[PDB]
Write a protein that binds this ligand. Structure first.
Ligand SMILES: *C/C=C(C)/C=C/C=C(C)/C=C/C1=C(C)CCCC1(C)C
Ligand SMILES: CCCCCCCC/C=C\CCCCCCCC(=O)O
Length: 271
């Protein structure tokens, strides 16, 4: 019953404190709420950039749609999966619920990772690289990263070595994506205004950090060891919190910066 994931495992054994249960619930709600807000932002501001850049706004909006819907479903899956026991005063896994399921989040990643990588190619111009090459490489490596991570995700309770080995494999595809993105951003800096170069530098830093947060949260409950402080409901809170910080940063803030970058490259900005 507490076999699928670390959330259920904890939920089925120690249970969650009211703080943990409520905090995790609140943070997941904030997550999907921000997505909805972002959806409207990206719809409303689309006329602020030239036609040639609008595919980036379009991909942002779509990412917002998928992340709102799936994070909303994730938020409900958390709350409905754990119920309060008066005798002990903690929340436990509910046999009559459907149990906490990582599926919503990983599906969201599968859908969104290729669009996010894709959309910067409609703002920035490449230099010595082919569009189709960059695109195909993002999409393959991106697909493999989530797939492999999702494989590892099944063994987090039952086989911690499979969990890490697969996560390592996933980290290999991630490293490759970083490497392509580096080339993309540096080629995109050439020729453009220093104001656009500056925004591109910010996008690199945002991208590097916010995406590295995901394997951070994947590893979170074991960052202190087998009997460590994080190997608890605290690890769940931290993991869920980091995932949410990452989602907002990699989707909404990334989208906003690309929007601002697009405006810098506008037709009437040219002499
Ligand atoms: C909007 C959602 C995004 C940008 C999701 C990104 C997810 C990742 C970069 C996940 C990476 C992982 C690893 C590199 C290793 C461990 C397993 C994953 C899937 C968490
Ligand atoms: C560049 C200045 C405009 C910043 C707009 C912020 C976008 C708001 C999106 C949802 C967050 C709540």
């Amino acid at each position: 019953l507490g076999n699928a994931n670390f959330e259920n495992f904890i939920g089925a054994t120690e249970g969650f404190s009211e703080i943990a249960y409520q905090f995790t619930s609140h943070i997941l709600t904030l997550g999907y709420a921000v997505m909805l807000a972002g959806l409207l932002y990206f719809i409303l501001t689309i006329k602020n950039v030239d036609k040639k850049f609008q595919m980036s706004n379009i991909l942002s909006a779509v990412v917002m749609v998928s992340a709102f819907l799936l994070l909303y479903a994730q938020a409900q899956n958390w709350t409905s999966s754990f119920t309060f026991n008066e005798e002990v005063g903690r929340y436990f896994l509910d046999p009559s619920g459907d149990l906490f399921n990582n599926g919503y989040r990983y599906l969201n990643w599968l859908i969104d990772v290729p669009m996010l990588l894709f959309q910067i190619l409609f703002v920035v111009s490449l230099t010595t690289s082919k569009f189709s090459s960059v695109r195909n490489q993002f999409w393959f490596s991106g697909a493999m990263m989530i797939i492999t991570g999702y494989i590892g995700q099944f063994y987090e309770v039952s086989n911690l070595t499979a969990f890490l080995v697969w996560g390592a494999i996933s980290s290999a595809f991630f490293f490759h994506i970083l490497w392509v993105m580096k080339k993309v951003i540096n080629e995109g800096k050439e020729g453009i205004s220093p104001a656009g170069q500056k925004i591109l530098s910010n996008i690199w830093i945002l991208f590097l950090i916010s995406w590295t947060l995901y394997p951070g949260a994947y590893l979170m409950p074991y960052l202190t060891g087998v009997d460590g402080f994080l190997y608890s409901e605290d690890g769940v809170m931290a993991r869920q919190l980091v995932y949410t910080i990452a989602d907002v940063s990699s989707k909404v803030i990334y989208g906003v910066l690309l929007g601002n970058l697009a405006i810098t490259l506008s037709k009437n900005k040219e002499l």
